[PDB]
Design an enzyme around this catalytic site. Structure first.
Site, mmCIF file in Angstrom:
data_model
loop_
_atom_site.group_PDB
_atom_site.id
_atom_site.type_symbol
_atom_site.label_atom_id
_atom_site.label_comp_id
_atom_site.label_asym_id
_atom_site.label_seq_id
_atom_site.Cartn_x
_atom_site.Cartn_y
_atom_site.Cartn_z
ATOM 1 N N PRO A 195 86.523 -37.608 -26.029
ATOM 2 C CA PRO A 195 85.092 -37.295 -25.864
ATOM 3 C C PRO A 195 84.563 -37.510 -24.450
ATOM 4 C CG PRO A 195 85.472 -39.167 -27.372
ATOM 5 C CD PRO A 195 86.712 -38.965 -26.556
ATOM 6 N N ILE A 196 83.991 -36.456 -23.895
ATOM 7 C CA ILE A 196 83.576 -36.414 -22.503
ATOM 8 C C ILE A 196 82.127 -35.953 -22.444
ATOM 9 C CG2 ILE A 196 83.931 -35.282 -20.307
ATOM 10 C CD1 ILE A 196 86.858 -34.890 -21.145
ATOM 11 N N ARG B 227 84.541 -40.849 -21.766
ATOM 12 C CA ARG B 227 84.233 -40.574 -20.383
ATOM 13 C C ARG B 227 82.806 -40.081 -20.251
ATOM 14 N NH1 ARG B 227 89.463 -42.112 -20.695
ATOM 15 N NH2 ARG B 227 90.521 -41.796 -18.673
#
Ligand SMILES: *C/C=C/C(=O)C(=O)O
Ligand SMILES: *C/C=C/C(=O)C(=O)O
Ligand SMILES: *C/C=C/C(=O)C(=O)O
Ligand SMILES: *C/C=C\C(=O)C(=O)O
Lengths: 60, 59, 60, 60, 62, 58
Positions: A1-2, A39
């Site tokens: 997951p960004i 992130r």
């Protein structure tokens, strides 16, 4: 997951550090994903570069 | 304040609804900005479309 | 010049063709740049994937 | 509807203000969406940060 | 180092796997950065969603 | 084909020129697409703007 977050320029380094942490946590919580995989990118916008209704945010 | 979150496909609609709310809240809190101005976009990635170290996450 | 436009799903192919043209033109005009260099990307969002004030746009 | 436009650095604040307005308008027109919901982000690129055909735009 | 690549839809899974590898390597080489830190995201565009000169790539392209 | 690469600030102009060329080439090779259609954008991030595990890369 960004996550990429666009925000108006003008905030302190501390506020931004907090943003990163709190958002990272919220993501981990919400998706039951390990915090260390998360992130976050902050992208600051100049006030003359952001429009709402065709008009700058630097006069709204 | 506009947040785009890329995540692997596979999560439930409820989880995603939660993600949107919790992140929106965290943004509003952190920047002392009104909650109603916060936008969140979720972008799901297929497992064959995400690479780490040159190799798919689907491996 | 490269533009990416996130919009809610639900519009017709014709509307989107128009969007591409009108925006491409507006960019070319505004920047005195050659129309043929202008690239536009439309990215459709599902209604369950877009939040305002922490709540889905498919409620509001 | 949220548009992000990447452009080369070097333009005036007025040109950019015009870009924001004209694009915002083109979006509203094209999608029959209310002008006040339209957001535009301008992202300026340094000339050494943009490639075409593997070569900088600062030798083009 | 995180790369996002927008491409027209229509390519095979193998071609995309190759794209990911070759690009990650080029990034690692170019920046002297460890290959395992490099992330790549591929984003496929529908042909009706991509414009050049105000016209779809699906009437200027296959 | 349009690539955007987010990297930490701090690198030289030469390194970045190389990044642009090598990545552009890799894309052209991999997709059998003409090199001259490939666009690359580099986006530098400040060290205080990039988080891993909720903590700065600094
Ligand atoms: C991130 C910017 C959003 C606003 O400023 C607003 O809509 O009020
Ligand atoms: C593009 C998304 C914004 C809206 O539709 C709105 O808030 O009106
Ligand atoms: C990446 C897509 C762009 C093209 O197809 C082109 O520029 O020819
Ligand atoms: C760009 C990806 C992340 C890093 O650079 C790191 O692992 O520090």
């Amino acid at each position: 997951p960004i996550a990429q977050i666009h925000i108006l320029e003008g905030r302190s380094d501390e506020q931004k550090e907090t943003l990163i942490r709190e958002v990272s946590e919220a993501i981990s919580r919400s998706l039951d994903a390990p915090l260390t995989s998360v992130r976050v990118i902050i992208t600051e916008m100049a006030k003359g570069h952001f429009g709402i209704g065709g008009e700058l945010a630097s006069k709204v």
